[PDB]
């Protein structure tokens, strides 16, 4: 392969598969000097691709803030919300609205926020003291010691899956979502309790996208050069969040070593499911393109909804407030 990622992944494929055969890629954290000579036009690429390619083989990052007994009592649903250090208003609105922990019929919902580091080296304002004050006051902050960037989000996925393997392998289901999304948690709990025991074992639902490919428009957010990745993407769910079983979370983590990190986290999770022999299932309750504006103020449009992107902190509280009495009028 000419594309860098496709080639290195097929090297991993031969490493983990003896039949394909007729410098740790996992904890070598020095800059990989060889990329500058092997990818055409390296020093003319954006800075994010240069950082992603130089340190592709480093993923043994450690927890700086932990909540090791978040799942001391077995949870039915684990809410894992990706967040950024300065997003205090988002995390707080999620705490008071749809991400509040509960135990209705002893079906335990627990919440964690997934953060990286916003170090001063990137000219980030020092907010660590307030993050500590929030971490001890709410005990829902998980934070590793890597640069929380847009191209390091697949690293956030892997590190979160390791935390589930270590501190929460007993949870029945996992919802992984964004901090700018509204989630009808009541509707998700109803859906989980309506599943067959067979379907619940390998659950993985979301706004699934088939036959997608990298965006070549350099001006786009998810732009991927052809020197980096070639071909089509595997089926994957994205756009705000997906829902799956705890059994599948343990299987997903244990093949992550066999898949190279990718600048798009949702594509990486899709690559991981495809190697397990599974296909993510499309569920139309994940309204990643929002809902029609003529209904954006009708609370009945949120009742049988799983997820809607996107919402500001005030709207999450407003919608969740109106949702509590929607059964008396919807
Ligand atoms: C994902 O997170 C990792 C860990 O935070 C980032 O790795 C870090 O990358 C920076 C550069 O972006 C490295 O600093 C550089 O060090 C070299 C000398 O080796 C120096 O010449 C540069 O001026 C700069 O100081 C840092 O060492 C490295 N840390 C680790 C632990 O590997 C990575 O960049 C992030 N990826 C993305 C796409 O943001
Ligand atoms: O470096 C980053 C950038 C994004 N996010 C999280 O990603 C989610 C949504 O990101 P965004 O809305 O920018 O993605 P988009 O909707 O544009 O695809 C939010 O939870 C952010 O906190 C993150 O954790 N680290
Ligand atoms: C990963 O482990 C190696 C030891 O093989 C070590 O040299 C490296 O610094 C570790 N990386 C991180 C980010 O801790
Ligand atoms: Cl079913
Ligand atoms: Cl609608
Ligand atoms: Mg978003």
Numbering used by the authors: 55 to 76, 90 to 397
Cite, word for word, the article reporting this structure.
β1,3-N-acetylglucosaminyltransferases (B3GNTs) are Golgi-resident glycosyltransferases involved in the biosynthesis of poly-N-acetyl-lactosamine chains. They catalyze the addition of the N-acetylglucosamine to the N-acetyl-lactosamine repeat as a key step of the chain elongation process. Among the characterized B3GNTs, B3GNT2 is the major poly-N-acetyl-lactosamine synthase, and deletion of its coding gene dramatically reduced the cell surface poly-N-acetyl-lactosamine and led to hypersensitive and hyperresponsive immunocytes. The luminal domain of B3GNT2 comprises an N-terminal helical domain (Pro55–Cys125) and a C-terminal catalytic domain (Cys138–Cys397) as well as an extended linker (Arg126–Lys137) that connects the helical domain to the catalytic domain.
The luminal domain structure of B3GNT2 was solved by single-wavelength anomalous dispersion phasing using an iodide derivative to a resolution of 2.50 Å. Subsequently, B3GNT2 structures in apo form or in complex with either substrates or products were determined by molecular replacement using the iodide derivative structure as the template. The six structures presented here were solved in different space groups and the number of molecules in the asymmetric unit also varied. The recombinant proteins used for crystallization contain residues Ser31–Cys397 or Lys45–Cys397, but only residues Pro55–Cys397 are well defined in the electron density maps, except for a disordered loop between residues Leu77 and Ser88.
